[PDB]
Write a protein that binds this ligand. Structure first.
Ligand code: KW6
Ligand code: ZN
Ligand code: ZN
Lengths: 109, 292
């Protein structure tokens, strides 16, 4: 399990994955977690989807049946406070199915 | 310093008309660095400014646009240029990128290997190249080849009429025929990014490929003219243009796509191509391979 492996490597004090591609945008977007365009708000940062996926970065198979990555080809918004480890944040958090925001970060449902 | 707010500076038509001997490039701003925004990669800033400048040109933007990006992998294993392109292009445009070494990309399809191994039975609407070998400067600066030979063939054989190109060059990484091929377009220039103004880097931008020469260009003379222009006109480094992104995405004009025989092409059609109002190619399914 790579997901559990990375969570443990962070807890051991290891440096988070770097070289996550941060985009330039107006920071006036909807704030939703995953979008086809950078939708970061003033409190968020927008990153390339492929660069923030552990399974894409490590050149391994994805945790799905059809080899579909929901990040690749799209943009993931990360809270600026958690911007030093975009890969970890996506691994540790879920997206509200109805409002499109992160559960616990911008979800009012 | 009005040009400091622009994405970059384009080669004036006056310097193109000259006939200069090639000389070494010595830039006043050499060694300087643009203070990039907090945590923004250089390729992100560079590609962003390039796309900003391209928005001022008469690019054809058909539905289901076909875009190909060469040399799209950086040493970090990611594809910063592809990220900007996907952000910049209309939703539904086919984006394919390639590089010699493996990398992770947000593009629809990624082809790994020497660019000469890329084969496609399809014409394309936009061609972007960042291909560059840091060891291509091997002691007289003569016309280079390699991936340039492929690029010129790709332009002449796999670029839809009315399509556009943006090919990276430097002082030593350049090609004479590519300069000549810029005359086959309705409009061309050399674009320098303000973030990378300290370098000899520039993007040869051809707009509205016409398939035949409207302007005869000596490749060797033109490169010397570009080198002369850079040596005489210092460019202030600037990342200011990166802070205005509201109008960044490429306006989708729904440009017409028509398959036309070469005999059907006349002056009226050429005027349409020159204005970014027409693309001539097949609308079939896109097939692209990377030999192994
Ligand atoms: N053929 C290629 N196919 C795909 N991508 C490519 C290349 C290439 C070349 C070359 C090359 C290298 N030595 C040579 C020596 C004598 C003559 C010609 C030469 C040509 C550079 N790139 C990528 O362009 C990015 C920008 O630096 C880099 O990521 C680099 O990986
Ligand atoms: Zn993935
Ligand atoms: Zn919710």
């Amino acid at each position: 399990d790579a997901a559990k492996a990375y969570k443990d490597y962070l807890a051991s004090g290891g440096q988070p994955i770097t070289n996550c591609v941060k985009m330039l945008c107006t920071h006036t977007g909807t704030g939703q977690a995953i979008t086809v365009t950078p939708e970061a708000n003033m409190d968020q940062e927008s990153f390339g989807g492929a660069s923030c996926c552990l399974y894409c970065r490590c050149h391994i198979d994805h945790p799905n049946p059809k080899g579909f990555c929901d990040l690749k080809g799209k943009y993931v918004q990360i809270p600026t406070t958690c911007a030093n480890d975009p890969v970890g944040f996506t691994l540790k958090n879920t997206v509200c199915t109805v409002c499109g925001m992160w559960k616990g970060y911008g979800c009012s449902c | 310093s009005s040009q400091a707010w622009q994405p970059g500076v384009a080669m004036p038509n006056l310097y193109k008309m000259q006939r200069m001997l090639l000389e070494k490039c010595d830039l006043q701003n050499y060694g300087d660095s643009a203070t990039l925004p907090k945590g923004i990669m250089m390729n992100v800033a560079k590609y962003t400014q390039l796309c900003q400048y391209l928005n001022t040109l008469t690019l054809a933007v058909p539905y289901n646009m076909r875009v190909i990006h060469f040399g799209a992998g950086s040493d970090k294993g990611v594809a910063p240029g592809t990220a900007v392109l996907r952000q910049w292009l209309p939703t539904g445009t086919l984006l394919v990128d390639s590089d010699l070494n493996d990398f992770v990309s947000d593009a629809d399809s990624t082809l790994i290997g020497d660019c000469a191994t890329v084969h496609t039975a399809n014409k394309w609407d936009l061609i972007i190249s960042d291909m560059y070998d840091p060891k291509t400067k091997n002691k007289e600066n003569d016309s280079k080849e390699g991936f340039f030979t492929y690029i010129c063939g790709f332009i002449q054989q796999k670029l839809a009429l009315g399509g556009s190109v943006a090919i990276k060059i430097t002082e030593h990484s350049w090609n004479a025929d590519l300069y000549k091929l810029m005359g086959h377009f309705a409009w061309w220039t050399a674009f320098v990014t303000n973030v990378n103004a300290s370098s000899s880097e520039a993007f040869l931008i051809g707009c509205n490929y016409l398939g035949k020469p409207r302007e005869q260009i000596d490749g060797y003379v033109m490169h010397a003219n570009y080198i002369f222009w850079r040596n005489t006109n210092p460019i202030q480094l600037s990342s200011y243009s990166l802070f205005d992104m509201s109008k960044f995405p490429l306006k989708l004009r729904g440009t017409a796509v028509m398959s036309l025989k070469e005999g059907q092409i006349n002056d009226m059609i050429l005027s349409l191509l020159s204005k970014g109002r027409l693309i001539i190619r097949e609308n079939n399914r896109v097939v692209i391979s990377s030999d192994v």
